[PDB]
């Protein structure tokens, strides 16, 4: 019994973690088999970053320019190459620590473990969502970047996340591992406004399932409702509309917990509508919507 | 820039996790060089556990009936012993991932991160306090007792929590790895009441210079306050005395921020006199208490 905020654990991804210097900017890559993957601003002086042409910067740089330092010892580089916002750099070694691993890009809503990096070191380990607005609130200090995020089933190691760029409003963005950028941001110290952030309602549900199994319960109501209904209040408290995928991927909570899915609606309507009462849910205060019904199933099961 | 509940990088502390089976229960070891330290209740039956007797129980317990496997390898047992509440378990090879380590036992109020284990397999990594009542609010399944608490000093992993047992309550209660239970706790499924726990008041500061400093200051305000005063509202709201011992460990936060410490706490005493207003700060609807000053620098300059 408990509830906490967990992340995988991290050390599959400490083995790959190494340093990045081009120039005089330093920061985190990614090395797996034999190939390092890094942030390509690394390339840049914050001078370029107002509006960096990356082709021709990338032009004037060398495959010894990229200096590649997995702990105390340094990887020989064979090739570059920028795809999207990422360089790929060929090193003549395989990291001999290079776990399963895939390459996924997650979908809003979606959690992930993100290992916090500074100068190809581990600093911390720390679970977060993809906010619907392709943000995350993350903690990203300068040298930060190239820091991923990633999920783990059994000993596969799915990369989801590489670190890029904070937002002047403290939210952080980044790409897939392929470069694509999450949202409309690109590698550019510009104006980028996110979007309107909703609450991940699904999320908020399971964690309210989460709270049922793990003895808080005084939130259960007397009332049902209907995806409809439910719909109008999650509109009035932008919170993402509830839909029967949604219904579906909830079914072993209900299931388990015997409480409908509208019920649980029912439940998340009153409390939309009338606070907390300066009450606590699995000792937070507010509705949390960083925990997705696979993150509840987990680790109220026991999954390694 | 963000604040984040951040664990340590849990990787030199998979290396170290075992399973270890007597009889029919199964539970998590931590091998470091040539031992095997675990919750000594691996030896009895959910009969036993009514009023064990582990001097008979361990009496008829051979060091070939201690079946200790780290993955997919099992590790000869040459010796054992009982220390107050863990076995130690002498295995004829040296755990080749064992990292510098030292045992720790930390202080009510101290933070640690805990690699909840089940099978001496990890399934997450999340950061805890030490209650004041020396309970710890965990994520536990059965199966999940010998899993670790820690703190890594750049390479020294400081071993300070031993998972044993869950109150009736839901709350979590363990050992040092020497084997003394924190707080009056038995390893025995009793009757055990845990004292009022309080809030770590000097923690709540820290995490209140932590949001100044990631840009959540609606909370200060013109006013400031004494030890003395502060001390009476403290009692008020059941948070733990202030000391010039607190006060002296916020000094670089204090001289960061610029914001006097008693300025800082007639701050607290207004959130505590007036709540948060439906506000809320670094994300959290109430006031967070598992965050040390020294876990506050640490994540506000980047220590790897
Ligand atoms: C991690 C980071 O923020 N790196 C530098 C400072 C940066 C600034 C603007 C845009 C981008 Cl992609 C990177
Ligand atoms: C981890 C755990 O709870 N183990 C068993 C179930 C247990 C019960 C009561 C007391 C103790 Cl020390 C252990």
Redo the contacts between chains.
Sequence with gaps: ????????????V??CMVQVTCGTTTLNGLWLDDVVYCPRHVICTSEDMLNPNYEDLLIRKSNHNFLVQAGNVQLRVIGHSMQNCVLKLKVDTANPKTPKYKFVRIQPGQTFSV?????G??????QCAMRPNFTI????????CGSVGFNIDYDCVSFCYMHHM?LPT???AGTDLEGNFYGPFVDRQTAQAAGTDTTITVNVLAWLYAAVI??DRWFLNRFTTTLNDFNLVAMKYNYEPLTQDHVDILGPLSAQTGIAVLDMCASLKELLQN??N?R?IL????LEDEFTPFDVV??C????
């Design positions: 019994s408990g509830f906490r905020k967990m992340a995988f654990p991290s050390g599959k400490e083995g290992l916090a990096c500074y100068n070191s581990p600093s911390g380990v720390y609130k993350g903690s990203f200090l300068n040298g930060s904070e403290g939210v952080h793990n003895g606070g907390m300066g606590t000792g937070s205060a507010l987990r680790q099961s026991g999954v390694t």
